[PDB]
């Protein structure tokens, strides 16, 4: 749990979030969101910094919770490098698919989070010796959570492309990772 990449990520999300409370959501979005304009396509940070933005205490705490719990496990059991790679690929791919689904105005760490969910479960399943796993007790919620976004649970506009893309990506990485060693 006490991993550097785990905490460096939690710290950044909290910095950025606080910045969002001072400046306002939209003003942070114009700089951190996925490129809305192909002119902006070379502002490379935007492909990753959308993961840093949250729009409610609930949004961020719920995300950081999962991230601490799942990110922690991968960092501890598998190193900081494996975590970063998972975070970068899924922030890049789930941003990418989410932009296709509903455009460039989104953010949150849930893309990376479903990738961690997908990864920890598929990896604990195929490579038990890797010392990580996900309670079926969680994978349930996982699936409630994803399908509840499909129905926009009580007006909650969820990034549905991000969740599934992230989920898929984690499963691919864990499956590939569960062939070596």
């Amino acid at each position: 749990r006490a991993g550097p990449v785990t905490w460096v990520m939690m710290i950044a999300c909290v910095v950025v979030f606080i910045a969002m409370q001072i400046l306002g959501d939209q003003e942070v979005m114009l700089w951190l969101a996925w490129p809305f304009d192909p002119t902006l396509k070379f502002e490379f940070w935007r492909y990753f910094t959308h993961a840093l933005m949250h729009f409610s205490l609930m949004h961020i705490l719920f995300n950081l919770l999962w991230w601490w719990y799942l990110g922690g496990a991968v960092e501890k059991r598998l190193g900081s490098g494996k975590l970063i790679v998972i975070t970068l690929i899924s922030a890049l791919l789930s941003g990418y698919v989410q932009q296709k689904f509903s455009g460039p105005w989104f953010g949150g760490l849930s893309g990376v989070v479903f990738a961690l969910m997908g990864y920890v479960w598929l990896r604990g399943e195929r490579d038990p010796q890797s010392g990580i796993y996900l309670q079926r007790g969680l994978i349930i919620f996982a699936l409630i959570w994803i399908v509840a976004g499909w129905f926009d649970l009580f007006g909650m506009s969820m990034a549905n492309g991000a969740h599934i893309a992230g989920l898929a990506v984690g499963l691919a990485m864990a499956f590939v990772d569960s062939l070596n060693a």
Binding site: S94, S102, F106, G107, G111
Partner: peptide, 5 residues
């Protein structure tokens, strides 16, 4: 609106 990942 915005969508929450």
């Amino acid at each position: 609106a915005v969508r929450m990942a």
